[PDB]
Symmetry: D2
Subunit: 417 residues, 4 copies
């Protein structure tokens, strides 16, 4: 909680509290609500399925929604290699499964993940994460044979560094463990967020990603991606990895928006990799639930038929220009990062020092809340802008104007915590 | 897939495939269906909630169903100490949370669990597990600082051993790591299933359980229980741990039946233990989902209103009697174990050698399936008996008669694989 | 410090402090002094080699003592298979090397060792150990993928158990992990002390050892032995494993007496196992030191020339009968375990309860010390009897008389701590 | 075996093989032989002790050389805080002990060590290591809760980077894991080579070292140093850490040259840190061997009496000039690093690209060997220069001229393997 709000109902990008007050949702429940709240087609799909079968573990009997969803997810995944899908409940358990699939297929034990990453809260995925110290404190020891590498930062760079220089420097950092203590032939996979979500909406440069991808292929390391936050149209392409040229992951984790916030996740992977493990050795009883699966079928169709991928791209381009214009009048805005309706607005004390301004960031979100918009922060000083992709233009403009007013009010000293 | 069969719809304890064939459910989807399939109150709760709010992450904003469920679960948990509740999506993640809370509260690392145990498929919970069925081939290394001890087997005992002798022998095995390499003062937690589900419906004797509970208290080791399979009325008490005298767990995992097979789980623990961690330390985006929460509220209401606990105790004792009578005519039944509607029928080659007859158990399964009843085996030779608690007596008797006929056909060599 | 006493010099089985006081050594510095203190032939070997070459790391240049010892150790190892040897500095690092060799050769992770065992003090060997709890306390997490099983106890048995029943019970416990959570095809080796040293001079029954050995052969698990305490003639055979019928280990650790207490250890293993790893990957700078190697060549020569294996066998049988006769007069002696000049004298409060009497044990060692004999306890209540193998009969009889007097004085309450 | 030749005898910096061929030693058995081969004072100390007492485990009885050495090591260790010493056999076990002392004193789990480091071949010290030459292939999983950070590289730097810029960039890398997944408050220790030996004779800049030292003190992390290769006058100070301003380590490992290559090591630590662990919990049987202890007393004496600290400083400054002069005529020499008689001469394909030239390096080694000098490489392309500190000027000049001719011959293409 940030402000003790109790939601009674919601539709599209609008939240209504128990009292009747209205809010514009710029969070979409951490990008679980790409399709907007209570989308008519998803509600109906949930209702109709519940009438027939609430649950049977698909490992004992197939159900139609699970069969249909498994085929479809295999189709829409990036690349042309034959795919298989394994269902879970959460992004967390999907990233735990990624570790399992990679170890079992390769016969290798080490996993490489990123500082700044967030992969979930189960013991495997929580070890991979590098987003929060409180995810390691008191609960160790963690999963063995996990190595963290730094994710490329395009904002706080060295003087005179180009995109090319940053890519090379961070790739050299990527190689350092492999040239010292970490055998590449013993690394099962690299797990990467094509754009880091919780880390602050940070996109790896094209050249950096191509270097890692090639490194993996050349050493027989699996290239895995986490699309749990950045997938299903969020970046203005179906998959965040499609922001890069011709990269097909060996394993991909999908969650959050998948079933409009119903607990469903998937690992989608190359056929051969996915066949190294199955039920009943790896299984979640309520995973691939038929009600959740019907919910997902409807939400996937909504993304396609309402053109939400295209809308995220064009609205994202627009929101990027609006925030850039705001940056010209508000020097507290240090960096505008936007790929689709998917933004990190980084607030700094000074543009030259780039020193984080967590105080100002919290004031903005407090102002916004008092003026009917829900927005939160990342890593202290970064506003996350991830509204449902269905957000009508009038509501988007309304929210942007509140944010512009927030910046002015924080400048004048008119906001207190 | 176990049955290679597509389920179309289901109600109560009757399953209907895509060709209209009817089946009596003696599996209840691994005891996730205590309240029976598509219960009228649960379907309505799901459909009504979906219309208002499909999802918002409870870590940002509260919703009424989640808050009400949190209160109700704290109230119905065993013991009189004030509890806190932490939601997840799966039993697996609830067991991961137990490791976290125990380690955080005690400041110790080691977790003790049992051989034969099943706790889930994430990296924490699957380390704790000890069923041959869900073993960790190809996926290691697992979570460090986990020791397995043997679970008391009251069937294959040494000649002349009483329940007293069994309790003492197994408690002596329990103490052996603590008297060698495992420091009691560095063990955070002992986690036990009060009755082992996947292990074969095996109940720890009263005296063994008291000895462990006391050992934990004397050394400041938390005593945790897994009620994911055996909870919510399955044993003919609300919780399996209530089959024992005056035992309040520090930590308890709950799942499967909690929300009628909708993905929801909980860790319910003593207030002090639960306060040792933050969250972000333990959070899932879709955990405590309002549709799932409303479904759970309704299944809990059904357990109360239809007196399902008492019905489980009553039908359980009936089913025990019935199988005991069958045992008198079919010496292939080596052991009848039953606490509530919750039975392990163990098949053997000879009454004295107690050699497992996995082939005979396979043949019973086939016969039952060919005759309209769904039942599975555990450990090859144990028939597991876990119908929905709502199973009408008429249907229970039908299933029981099919089982009787299966034993007859198997004796006479009339079933072929 | 155990005795709080400065040794000036020593020879054979006699120790001399800085005051001139003489002691009979029944410890032989934890069996590192099989050949007796300052043996003339060993002293000469040390001095002559120190004038030629104190050290060069044999991984850069070979030296003649190292090459000769390497061939000698390959030849005297139990069995007929071609062997190779790898040198270390301590028993501990030899056991660390066993883990390495087994994991490297098999491509598997898990190591099985015994409760009650002692393998050393480095992170690998100390994880495998299971005697002192202090050895795990405060220093975790330890090496992952290690499982401890119980070592067969022939003294505190169930009423009416034969040696056959003991072997079968303990072999059943051995198998329990493999039938639950531990995959046999993922375990690299079993490390076993053929007689447990620090465990209390406990010998696995023949039948037990055969069952484990066969289990290992059948599953491709390496069968590894620790001969650091019990090797080099201590049991009245060259190797403790030779007390068993036709067992050739895949790997064997040797230390302590190898170089008369100079730091030198070895792993002796089958050729194909030993070639799975080499220097410079696995290497200790001062391992295979030419002075230590010359000392070792000399001590091995003494064992042969003075017939110390047979002398241990015949003096050990004599000493066993002496302790058996003491036992008749002194009921505090519950168990006499003795194989060669290698004994555990177990002290108990009552012969039927077998309750440990640590108090009587420490009083015996106090009396012995005040009367010119050095002897210590294991596990509180067991007198450890391991004199140098060269101990003259007159001196052995002298020490045995003091112990008889000690037992009489402890009975009469004449000893105050 | 590196050279395929058998050493028969050696004295000072000259080695003689079995055929009578003389070699000048620029390896000194990886810096185990600081005081020169078979030094008269050390040979005599070995022989004289061997006559009195070859061994007794000093945990049972004190011996005089062990007592004197313990006092002398506590005295000559850097800084003015009271120290305690714990003996081992090898640098590997001393570094394993460092982990143990740090975890036990702090009650924290995590250990930070460096890429490019070498700390030994036991499971603890080998996990900490980061030398490609000592990779842990096939032997995992390793010790849990170990994080590697990059060591400052002052040769392959970014354009226009100063020593200051290097110190700040590498300190920024040091902090990255602490700002992502590694809690400072849960890390027990940072272990650092003041100059990395096996890493290629790489010295951390003063400013970097002060930053790490300060960070450790401010977070309650123990600051540990490894002086096994770089201690005992090798750098031209007694300890390599004395190359830096006012740094007193909490823990220091010492070995290799400590007893002229006899197996002996020590952890020297602040008194309150060392008291956290005891014996018999932590103990090696043959550690602090009296013959080894006597050898060490004599080598320490030679270091003082022959003024070898000063000799290394002035011969090293001389050797740096000679190699710098060679660099002028031989552009294949990319970098000359030298602190005492202790150098890394790095060979490259081109002065601007700095591409490593391993082929040129192995050819130089081969030529040198063919003309009577012993020298090896590190990291493929770095000539390592560590002769005994006693090397007479005439012999040094002789060896330096052979190296000069080697560069000439490789340049002209006259060397083939
Ligand atoms: C939220 C998130 C997860 C974990 O998903 P849950 O459903 O909360 O377990 C994993 N990866 C990324 C990138 C996320 O944003
Ligand atoms: C099935 C089960 C679990 C795990 O639940 P999932 O929802 O399948 O993760 C945990 N414990 C027990 C006793 C179980 O039967
Ligand atoms: C003492 C001992 C060790 C360890 O030897 P160190 O040389 O003290 O490291 C290993 N195994 C056994 C059986 C021992 O008695
Ligand atoms: C050689 C070395 C060690 C290990 O010493 P051993 O005696 O070979 O175990 C540790 N640290 C450094 C810096 C070394 O050079």
């Amino acid at each position: 909680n940030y402000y003790n709000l109790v939601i009674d109902h919601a539709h599209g990008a609008t939240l209504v509290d128990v009292d009747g007050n209205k809010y514009i949702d710029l969070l979409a429940s951490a990008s679980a609500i790409n399709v907007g709240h209570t989308h008519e087609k998803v509600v109906k799909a949930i209702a109709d399925q519940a009438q027939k079968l609430i649950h049977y573990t698909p490992a004992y009997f197939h159900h139609v929604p699970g069969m249909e969803l498994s085929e479809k997810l295999a189709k829409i995944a990036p690349g042309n290699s034959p795919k298989m899908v394994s269902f879970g409940n959460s992004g967390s358990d999907a990233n735990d499964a990624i570790i399992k699939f990679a170890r079992a297929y390769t016969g290798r034990q080490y996993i490489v993940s990123y500082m700044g990453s967030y992969h979930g809260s189960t013991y495997g995925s929580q070890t991979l994460s590098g987003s929060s110290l409180n995810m390691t404190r008191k609960i160790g020891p963690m999963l063995p044979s996990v190595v963290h590498v730094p994710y490329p930062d395009s904002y706080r760079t060295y003087p005179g560094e180009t995109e090319h220089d940053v890519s090379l420097r961070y790739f050299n950092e990527f190689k350092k463990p492999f040239e010292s203590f970490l055998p590449a032939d013993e690394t099962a996979c690299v797990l990467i967020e094509p754009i880091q979500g919780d880390g602050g909406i940070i996109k790896a440069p094209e050249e950096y990603m191509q270097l890692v991808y090639k490194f993996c292929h050349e050493h027989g390391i699996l290239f895995a991606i986490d699309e749990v936050n950045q997938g299903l149209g969020r970046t203005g392409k179906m998959w965040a990895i499609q922001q890069f040229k011709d990269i097909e992951p060996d394993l991909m984790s999908v969650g959050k928006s998948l079933a409009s916030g119903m607990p469903l996740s998937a690992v989608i992977g190359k056929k051969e990799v996915m066949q190294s493990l199955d039920a009943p050795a790896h299984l979640f009883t309520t995973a691939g639930n038929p009600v959740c699966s019907a919910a997902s079928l409807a939400t996937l169709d909504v993304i396609e038929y309402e053109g939400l991928v295209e809308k995220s791209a064009t609205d994202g381009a627009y929101a990027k220009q609006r925030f850039l214009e705001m940056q010209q009048r508000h020097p507290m805005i240090g960096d505008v990062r936007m790929w689709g309706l998917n933004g990190g607005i980084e607030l700094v004390k000074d543009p030259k020092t780039k020193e984080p301004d967590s105080d100002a960031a919290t004031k903005v979100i407090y102002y916004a809340f008092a003026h009917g918009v829900v927005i939160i922060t990342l890593a202290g000083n970064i506003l996350r802008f991830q509204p449902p992709l269905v957000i009508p233009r009038e509501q988007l403009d309304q929210a942007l104007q509140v944010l512009d007013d927030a910046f002015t009010a924080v400048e004048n000293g008119e906001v207190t915590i």
